[PDB]
């Protein structure tokens, strides 16, 4: 397991989705991702997790109407082709069908600031974007009271890793309590299913396992 992978759930990180730890050990050949991509602010994101205490997950409550949400890939095999455990891959539900302008708002009910992660998909070919998300301009915008940014796919071939020319890029935010993150997208968007909550921000309500040290080690455990 790569550490960042605990947040979004590749098959690797299946055991450690809701782990509780005083000491966290990263390992060298670990891969944060099943389908090739990289986290924005990656090194900064891990340092958060190492000292988290572990993480608790709860569903963001999103529901969908007319879309394929069950997107699967050769990259996330898991008995049969699959995806990130904690996200949904959204597709047109009929090939080459232009994707719906949709909006989502999720609001941070809990006292601890939530961790939210989302994806932008850069399709293997200009064709594949079309097949997947329909045709025309693609825009994704993420809005929070402290955060707003807009993302667009830049579709092309890239060197084949894990058998995929396509890439998924993850962007994350910290959401204060009582704050709404608004998700608006016409496609190419990988959606959070679950919010990540640190355990050292818990109220001593027995999830709470405070203040871990994350190390990098080649040694066994004892």
């Amino acid at each position: 397991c790569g550490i960042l992978g605990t947040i979004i759930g590749p098959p690797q990180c299946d055991l450690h989705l809701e782990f509780k730890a005083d000491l966290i050990i990263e390992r060298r050949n670990s891969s944060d991702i099943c389908y090739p991509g990289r986290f924005t602010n990656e090194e900064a994101l891990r340092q958060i997790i190492r000292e988290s205490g572990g993480i608790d997950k709860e569903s963001m409550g999103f529901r969908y109407s007319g879309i394929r949400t069950d997107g699967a890939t050769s990259a996330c095999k898991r008995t049969v082709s699959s995806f990130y455990s904690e996200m949904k891959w959204l597709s047109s539900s009929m090939n080459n069908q232009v994707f719906p302008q949709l909006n989502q708002t999720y609001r941070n009910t809990r006292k601890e600031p939530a961790l939210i992660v989302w994806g932008v998909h850069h399709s293997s070919s200009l064709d594949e974007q079309n097949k997947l998300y329909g045709t025309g301009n693609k825009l994704i915008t993420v809005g929070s009271s402290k955060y707003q940014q807009s993302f667009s796919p830049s579709p092309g071939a890239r060197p084949k890793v894990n058998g995929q020319a396509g890439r998924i890029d993850f962007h994350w935010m910290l959401l204060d309590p009582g704050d709404t993150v608004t998700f608006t997208f016409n496609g190419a968007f990988i959606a959070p299913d679950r919010a990540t909550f640190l355990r050292s921000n818990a109220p001593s309500g027995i999830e709470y396992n405070g203040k871990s040290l994350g190390i990098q080690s080649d040694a066994q455990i004892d």
Partner: antibody
Amino acid sequence: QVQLEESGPGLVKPSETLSLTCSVSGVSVTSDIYYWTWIRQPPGKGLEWIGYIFYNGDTNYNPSLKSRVTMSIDTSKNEFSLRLTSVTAADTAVYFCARGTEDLGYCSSGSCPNHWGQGTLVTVSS
Amino acid sequence: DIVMTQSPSSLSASIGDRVTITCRPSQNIRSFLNWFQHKPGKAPKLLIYAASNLQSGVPSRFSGSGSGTEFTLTIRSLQPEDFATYYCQQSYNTPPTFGQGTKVEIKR
């Protein structure tokens, strides 16, 4: 998904300027994520990376050559080019143009050319 | 400025044989290592990217392994069309640098 055809003189006299062009087919040289690279191989020697250029203007040239080399992208002709000044016999080589895709999860910026042309020989001689 | 030491410089092997080429960079480069194939008069071709990822059109008899300071290209059952010069290439810092190459010749 892209084709890359190199062109240029073939013979350049010592101390003169070497110019090469790469005709690109199948993609546009105006794309935000690709970079365009030159590499060379002297007869019987190793491959030597020359540099990369992005449409946005970002470039990086091998320090062995940086004070003599420039590259440019011609958007109108869908081409990119190499210019190498004050050549000597050490610059006789097969010159390859290549495309790569920015991929900072797996590669330094501009450092993984993955679609190459077949190369064109340049001989520096009087 | 990272020096790539490839070995052997040349080898000969029979059709169907398993061939192994090693690359040792002068410093640890994690997985930022690519393998190229160069057949006479054709464009050099990226075979393996990021130490182990097979490129489109490359036969599965080709495999890359290793990380850090030792990398291996294996060709598991040599075919006549695999006659070529193979190069490793580090993508870890600028300038990208190449191994001096391994010429693979076929015994028949």
